[PDB]
Chains A and B, each alone.
Chain A
């Protein structure tokens, strides 16, 4: 009947969305791995937001330029058309159903003087990301910097006031995607019990830090192979923070073994018990030039003189991505967590 064709399609959408979530997590773990090779110390970024940024590029490329991006994001094929819109519609729904989540995302397209964008790409960007177009003069670099930093400061609500540092005058288009997460703990820590405590930087050195304290039902498990505790710190709106604490000072570096299956194994072995939790407050602010990193993930041609972005522009040929920068700030607190990521892509002539 009419249900038959739509009932099969819902099963497929349900399957495809699980596949996309899994692929985004693994994409994230790949990045964490690449990033860690250069940066010791604290790190934070948004896999979801990073892969939205890249899929934004991808729709716009063709040939080896496009297919290299699909591989880098782990975006494997699906079953048998024209059902990509339904997949994005389904993702928005899922991220919109729970009004307590506190998650907003958005997208900008900053465009150079009279550089005409193809119509089908403009449309899709609004349909999939609700992209907002703003004319620009990147030749007048100092002026464009101030104007773009105003827009990102507005939308990130003051937490990333200066995303842009230097402006390449040969820039024809830059795509910015942002993600804002205002999470409230499902049971907040009472700041009356926050105390100064000893944190171990390594086997020899220590430092004193504010430790928040909660006592009650928490979900956790102990992986005996990696010798680590995993703990769920739930938010309102059906989000959660997984915390992974290694028992011994790096030894078996988790980064290199981290996969969707390992996390699924932990989530399966969780048990809930009355327990006491000490957990430190922290702010992070990190900034990563993704260009060379993405190149290591096999996304090459988009950055080369032979980049094919002919779905982004009809005529324009000598176009390429020169820079992909990601800036992420997080603040963990007695009330919850507030995390903002901004991601920009410099398209150059």
Chain B
């Protein structure tokens, strides 16, 4: 009776996949989103 909440409020890893082939197009870590 209270939906889950996921808050990406700390360093995280990301992966962009093309799901048909299964190819990992991009792979990364974000440790601070306010800068390059």
Nearest chain B CB to A95 CB, angstrom units? 6
How long is the Cα–Cα vector from A126 to B16 in the complex, in angstroms? 26
Say whether A101 contacts B17, CB under 8 Å. Answer: no
CA gap between A254 and B11 in the complex, in Å: 12
Q: Please state if B22 and A284 are interface contacts (CB–CB under 8 Å).
A: no
- How many residue pairs between the two chains, A and B, have CB atoms under 8 Å in the bound complex? 170
CB of A200 within 8 A of CB of B19, answer no
Complex contacts, B5 vs chain A, CB 8 Å:
275-278
Of B4, B6, B36, which is within 8 A of A283 by CB?
Answer: B36
Q: Would A40 and B31 be within 8 Å (CB), given that A245-B6, A254-B13 are in contact?
A: yes
Residue of A nearest to B4 (CB): A275
CB-based contact B31/A42 at 8 Å: yes
Q: Residue A242 contacts which of B10, B14, B22 (CB distance < 8 angstroms)?
A: B14
Of all chain A residues, the one with the shortest Cβ separation from B25 is A48
Is B12 within 8 A of A200, CB to CB?
Answer: no
In contact, B9 and A337 (Cβ under 8 angstroms): no
Report the minimal beta-carbon distance from A159 to chain B, rounded to whole angstroms.
13
Contact across chains for A48 and B24 when beta carbons are under 8 A apart: yes
Instruction: Report the nearest B residue to A97, measured CB to CB.
Output: B20
Q: In this assembly, does A131 line the interface, its C-beta being within 8 Å of a C-beta of chain B?
A: no
Q: How far is the CA of A262 from the CA of B2 in the complex (A)?
A: 30
The secondary-structure label for the interface of chain A is strand
Please tell me if the beta carbons of A245 and B8 are within 8 angstroms of each other in the complex: yes
Also in contact, A46 and B36, with CB within 8 A (given A276-B5, A280-B8): no
Q: Which of A179, A244, A328 has the most CB of B within 10 A?
A: A244
Give the nearest-CB partner of A44 in chain B.
B28
* Cα distance A209–B7 in the bound complex, in angstroms: 13
For chain A, residues 219 to 244, give those with C-beta under 8 angstroms from any C-beta of chain B. Answer: 220, 229, 231, 235, 238-244
Q: Kindly supply a per-residue 1/0 record for chain A positions 164-181, scoring 1 wherever the CB is within 8 Å of any chain B CB and 0 otherwise.
A: 000000000000000101
B15 pairs with A242, CB closer than 8 A: yes
* Distance, CA A223 to CA B17, complexed state (A): 20
A239 with B28: CB separation less than 8 A: no
Q: Is A13 an interface residue (CB 8 A)?
A: no
Q: Is A70 interfacial (CB 8 A cutoff)?
A: no
Given A181-B16, A240-B16, A240-B19, A200:B27 Cβ within 8 A? no
Residues of B within 8 A of A (CB): 3-36
Which A residues contact B (CB, under 8 angstroms)? 17-18, 21-22, 24-25, 28-29, 31-32, 36, 40-49, 91, 94-95, 97-98, 101, 103, 179, 181, 183, 197-201, 207, 209, 211, 215, 218, 220, 229, 231, 235, 238-246, 249, 254-255, 263, 273-286, 328, 330, 337, 339, 341
